[PDB]
Amino acid sequence: DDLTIEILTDDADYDLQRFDCGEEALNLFLTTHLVRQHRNKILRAYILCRNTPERQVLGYYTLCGSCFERAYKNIPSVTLGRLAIDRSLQGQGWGATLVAHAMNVVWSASLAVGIHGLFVEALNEKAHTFFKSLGFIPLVGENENALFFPTKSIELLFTQ
Amino acid sequence: HRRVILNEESWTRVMDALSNPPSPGEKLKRAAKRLQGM
Numbered sequence: 001d002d003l004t005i006e007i008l009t010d011d012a013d014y015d016l017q018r019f020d021c022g023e024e025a026l027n028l029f030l031t032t033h034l035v036r037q038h039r040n041k042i043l044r045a046y047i048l049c050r051n052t053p054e055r056q057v058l059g060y061y062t063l064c065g066s067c068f069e070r071a072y073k074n075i076p077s078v079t080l081g082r083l084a085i086d087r088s089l090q091g092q093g094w095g096a097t098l099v100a101h102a103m104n105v106v107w108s109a110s111l112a113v114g115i116h117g118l119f120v121e122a123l124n125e126k127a128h129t130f131f132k133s134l135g136f137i138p139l140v141g142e143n144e145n146a147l148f149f150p151t152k153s154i155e156l157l158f159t160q
Numbered sequence: 161h162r163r164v165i166l167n168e169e170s171w172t173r174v175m176d177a178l179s180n181p182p183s184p185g186e187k188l189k190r191a192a193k194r195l196q197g198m
């Protein structure tokens with residue numbers, strides 16, 4: 001395959017204007033906010049691209065360190081806040097491959113500093129179903145848009 | 161985009177996920193195998 005998954009490169013140029021995932025909010029985030037938020041350290045942005053000098057982006061995901069707390073304890077974690085796949089690639093399982101990439105990054109970081117899980121943001125029922133099919137535990141009430149996956153399950157994915 | 165996750169009974173679901181971690185399903189295993197050789 002011609003496609004690769006890599007973290008956004010600090011001094012590289014990307015072809016993003018053409019990107020279309022079907023959600024207007026995720027498109028505008030990529031073409032006006034993603035690059036500056038990554039470079040300004042607000043998040044860590046990972047790109048699915050064509051591995052050409054032109055760097056045509058056909059999907060992306062964003063990560064940021066977080067902590068989960070109850071209305072007692074604390075959970076050092078990582079949040080996957082955005083996931084978008086271009087319409088041209090949809091149906092080939094690229095969304096799931098990007099989550100597996102994310103999980104491997106989060107796993108490596110747990111092995112280094114100690115992170116107990118991965119939280120994900122699902123703004124709609126189609127994404128919630130997608131994250132549930134990948135094994136994420138759905139949270140309820142105020143946390144209805146969040147799903148959780150522990151580091152121990154990620155370790156199981158890349159060791160068995 | 162959440163750096164402060166504030167839980168309630170969602171807290172027990174996360175606690176239970178930590179003590180009883182889910183087994184990776186076939187869909188996720190496929191994604192992991194696709195990622196392996198890329």
Ligand SMILES: [Cl-]
Pocket residue numbers: 092093094095096097
């Ligand atoms: Cl997918």
